[PDB]
Amino acid sequence: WARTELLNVCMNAKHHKEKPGPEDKLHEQCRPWRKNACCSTKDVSYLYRFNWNHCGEMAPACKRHFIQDTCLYECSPNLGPWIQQVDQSWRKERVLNVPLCKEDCEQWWEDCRTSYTCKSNWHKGWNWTSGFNKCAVGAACQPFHFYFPTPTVLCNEIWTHSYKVSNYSRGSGRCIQMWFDPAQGNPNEEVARFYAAAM
Ligand SMILES: *[C@@H]1O[C@H](CO[C@@H]2O[C@@H](C)[C@@H](O)[C@@H](O)[C@@H]2O)[C@@H](O[C@@H]2O[C@H](CO)[C@@H](O)[C@H](O)[C@H]2NC(C)=O)[C@H](O)[C@H]1NC(C)=O
Ligand SMILES: *[C@@H]1O[C@H](CO)[C@@H](O)[C@H](O)[C@H]1NC(C)=O
Ligand SMILES: [Cl-]
Ligand SMILES: [K+]
């Protein structure tokens, strides 16, 4: 029998698994998840509550990945196998070692080369005085790859091991994609099913 508590599930604030639904208005730009989302019909969304421009303006090509990243985390109903019991430090669920596809990670790392940041663990240590995050005193802004010198360090460390970049590539059926064309189905559904069956 399928471990359905790990499939097509969203972890809610009372730490019960609930079903996804129609995507809410705030997440309209998370297009791939319009029909089936954990961000479904107050908010705690990194679509606007997080300062991407903490070290000057982030390049558009870089920010796009962070939107995809935000969308996956907030909307995906296919992260069940990686959802953890404790998530008190996270705005929604806590996931651990999500097998991000090789390309998603590598392209993310390359597209953010010309951007800047001041720390490698974006999950903690920000100064929230202004209502949004700024680099704390002592945290020097540097080129992106100064804090993330390899795709692995970026994807694995930026959100403290929310991802573990996979050696598998898109289409393998064995890694989670950060974005996709929903008209061609949702590729991460079979990936979730696969890991639920194996773990
Ligand atoms: C966190 O940031 C504040 C400085 O914040 C700025 O001023 C705020 C009032 C607000 O307008 C923010 O948007 C600005 O970015 C630091 O506060 C200073 O704190 C020190 C003592 O540590 C004090 O001597 C200064 O007068 C404060 N300056 C101001 C302008 O209030 C605080 O230190 C920062 N914390 C860390 C660890 O980075
Ligand atoms: C990645 O490594 C795993 C574990 O060794 C292996 O099973 C798989 O074939 C590899 N995937 C590749 C090379 O695309
Ligand atoms: Cl968070
Ligand atoms: K998904």
Swiss-Prot record:
Instruction: Relate the outcome reported for changing residue 94 to A.
Output: Moderately reduced affinity for folate
Q: Select a single GO molecular function from the record's annotations and give it.
A: folic acid binding
Q: What sections of the sequence does the record tag as coiled-coil?
A: none
Q: Which domain of life is it from?
A: Eukaryota
The cellular location(s) given in this protein's UniProt record come to: Cell membrane; Apical cell membrane; Basolateral cell membrane; Secreted
**Expression sites (tissue/organ):** Primarily expressed in tissues of epithelial origin. Expression is increased in malignant tissues. Expressed in kidney, lung and cerebellum. Detected in placenta and thymus epithelium.
Question: A GO biological process this protein is involved in?
Answer: cell adhesion
Q: Which residues are glycosylated?
A: 127, 167
Keyword line? Cell membrane, Cytoplasmic vesicle, Disulfide bond, Endosome, Folate-binding, Glycoprotein, GPI-anchor, Lipoprotein, Membrane, Neurodegeneration, Receptor, Secreted, Signal, Transport
Consequence of changing residue 90 to A: Moderately reduced affinity for folate
Summarize the PTM comment.
Answer: The secreted form is derived from the membrane-bound form either by cleavage of the GPI anchor, or/and by proteolysis catalyzed by a metalloprotease.
Q: What does this protein do?
A: Binds to folate and reduced folic acid derivatives and mediates delivery of 5-methyltetrahydrofolate and folate analogs into the interior of cells. Has high affinity for folate and folic acid analogs at neutral pH. Exposure to slightly acidic pH after receptor endocytosis triggers a conformation change that strongly reduces its affinity for folates and mediates their release. Required for normal embryonic development and normal cell proliferation.
* Family membership noted in the UniProt record: Belongs to the folate receptor family.
Protein name according to UniProt:
Folate receptor alpha
Gene this protein is translated from: FOLR1
Counting on the full-length protein, the chain here runs from: 28 to 233 of 257
